[PDB]
Amino acid sequence: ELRVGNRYRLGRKIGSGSFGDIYLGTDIAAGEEVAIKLECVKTKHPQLHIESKIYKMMQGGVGIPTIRWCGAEGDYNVMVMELLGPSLEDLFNFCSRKFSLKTVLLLADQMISRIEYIHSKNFIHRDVKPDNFLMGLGKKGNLVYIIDFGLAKKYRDARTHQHIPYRENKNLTGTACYASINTHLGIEQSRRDDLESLGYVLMYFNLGSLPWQGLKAATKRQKYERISEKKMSTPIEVLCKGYPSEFATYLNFCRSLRFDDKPDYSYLRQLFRNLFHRQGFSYDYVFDWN
The missing domain is CATH 3.30.200.20 (Phosphorylase Kinase; domain 1)
Incomplete structure (x- = not known):
């Protein structure tokens, strides 16, 4: 065997x-699937x-x-x-590619926290996308997990917290569709870029699509150029039209962060919490799929 x-x-x-x-994988003895x-x-x-x-x-x-x-x-x-469990893309599909505002905000609160936690351990993720978030199992089926550290990079020294220098990027890149504008411009990613990518993920869930998905007969490396140009030419206010302004405020905030700034994770969560509560929602972990 x-x-x-x-x-x-x-x-x-x-x-x-x-x-x-x-x-x-199947633990031959324990029976547990891995x-x-x-x-x-x-x-x-x-x-x-x-x-x-x-x-x-x-x-x-x-x-x-x-x-x-x-x-x-x-x-x-x-x-x-x-x-x-299933990824957030899988669950989006189980939900016929429609999430309620309540579910988007339940997810947003936990995803900001997951990214903050990685940053607290001195890394940036660099490939924030729907398939890298998954729900737990059983008791922990209400918890959003983040996965895949193969593109992750240290952004500060563990002992001194000296931030990596502002430079042209050297390392391999994550998905084009969720990449930050700084990534398209060839600058090293930092904490702000992970959070900007999350903003595109959230708007993807709101819309079902992003305006830069859908491409042209080309070399594929042109295809990356197409995504870059449409993303840079699409104002946050156009992208977020017809959704609560907090999604636009979130993205503008992330784009305006300085490279070595500690993001105000609390502010970003609080934008969404106060919107969530104004609709009469409770943080009761009842997602659309429940």
Whole structure:
């Protein structure tokens, strides 16, 4: 029987992540289902070990999955991960690509907090998108988790908190559709960029689409140019027309942050909390899918 170590039976592919695919796993003894990420070792720049280290530095945070680095069985590096529930994109689809305002705001409160927590541990995520947020299981089915640290980067020194310098970006980039304007301009990402991307995710949930999705017959690398140009030419006020002004205020705030600023996470959450409460909502974790 093909197993990881002696413990995790390997199953079918269940998805993709940064730098490697994900397969279903079954603790032969415990019966518990896990996710197993595999990275081919044939590369001069391996990433999965680094990613496992970041997860380990985040462990114990609310909404951070538990992982196990297992080193290299033959041609693959192996990381075993807590199996979570559906992603927010999956749940958006279960909801026929319509979320209520209450659900968007329930999600927004937790997603800002998840990003704040990563930042508190000295990293930026750099690939904020719907598929990297997933709901927990069972008791923790009301908790939003954030996943995938393969593109994450330290933005400040752990001992001195000296911020990384403002420079042209060197590292690989996340999805074009949710990238910040600074990323399109070739500047190193910092805390502000993670939060700006979250603003595009929230407006995606509000709209069902973003105005820069949908593309032209081209080289694909042109396709990135198309997304960049439409995003930069679309004012936040046009993007957010017809939705509560807090979504536009949120995005303007993130765009106006200085590179090394500590974002006012509380302000951003409070914009949405006071909107949520003005509608008579309660933070009772009853999402549309419940």
